[PDB]
Design a protein around this ligand. Sequence first.
Ligand SMILES: CCOc1cccc(-c2ccc3c(NC(=O)c4ccccc4)n[nH]c3c2)c1
Ligand SMILES: [Cl-]
Length: 288
Amino acid sequence: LPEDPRWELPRDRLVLGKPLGEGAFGQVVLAEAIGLDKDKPNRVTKVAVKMLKSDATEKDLSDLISEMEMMKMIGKHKNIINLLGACTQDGPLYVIVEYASKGNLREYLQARRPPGHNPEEQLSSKDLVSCAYQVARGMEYLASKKCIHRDLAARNVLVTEDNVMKIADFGLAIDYYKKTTNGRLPVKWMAPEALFDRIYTHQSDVWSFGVLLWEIFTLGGSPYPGVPVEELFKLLKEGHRMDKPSNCTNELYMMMRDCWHAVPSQRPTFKQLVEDLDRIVALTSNQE
Ligand SMILES: CCOc1cccc(-c2ccc3c(NC(=O)c4ccccc4)n[nH]c3c2)c1
Ligand SMILES: [Cl-]
C-alpha cells in the first residue's frame, strides 16, 4: 500500500499488547506508542491497534483500508474515536486509534448499577444526562461531516479513563437474526424505514439515538427482552413504543418519543438534541 506521511508511524514505535473488544470490532489490541507526537518523542501513549486476523480475505483487507481512509476524511472530535496513525509499510497493516480504558457504555453503565453485585462507582442523574449530551455532540459532529452511523447503540460508544464518551465504528459502510457478542439483536436499534425500506439517513440515526437514551436511563437495559425478529416487526408496524424507564424525567422520555417519531422529517436533529441536552444537564441534580 502507498505510504501516507500524514499518518505513518515506524513499526518499532509500537509495543503490541493483549486483545480488547471481544472480537466485536475485529482484531483490536492494546499497544503503547512511543513518540506518537513528533513534538514529544520520549512519551508513551496507550492506543488501540486494529489489524487483520490470520485467515483474513482480500475483502477483509479492503474494509480495514476503507475504514482508515474515512477517519482521515472525517477529522477530529472529542466525542469520537480518533485516528492517531498507521503502520502501512514493511509488515501487516496497523491502524492506530484512541484507547478507551473503561470499555463500551453498556458495560460501563451495568458495572455502576446500585447493589443487588456491590460496585466501586455510582452515577448521578447529571452524569447520565451528561453521557447523553456527549453522544449527541459526537453524532452532531459526524452528521456535519455527512457520516451516517447505521448502528448507533451503547455497545458502539466507548468510555475513556476520564469518562469521555466516544462514538466508535462510524468509519465502516445485513442478517436480521445475527446477534451481538452480548446476545442482543441489532434490529432493535433500527428505524422502521431503515429496517423495512433499507433507507438510512441522519434521521434513522436519531431513532437509534432514542434507543440509546433508553439504554442510558435503564443503566444498560436490554430493549425488548425476549422479543424475536418477527415479533419486533409486528411491534413496529402497530406503532409500539417502549415504556418510560424508572428514574427518568417526563422531559427525557418525551425526547425519546420525539426521536421515535413515525415520520423521519418530524424527529429532532442532533443539533436540536445537543441544545436541549445542554440546557437539561445544567438543570439536573448531581445530589442523587
Ligand atoms: C480503524 C478502525 O478502528 C476501530 C474500529 C472499531 C473499534 C475500534 C476500537 C475498539 C475498542 C477500543 C477500546 N477499548 C476497548 O475495546 C476496551 C474493552 C474492554 C475494556 C477496556 C477497553 N479503546 N479504543 C478502541 C477502539 C477501533
Ligand atoms: Cl448490546
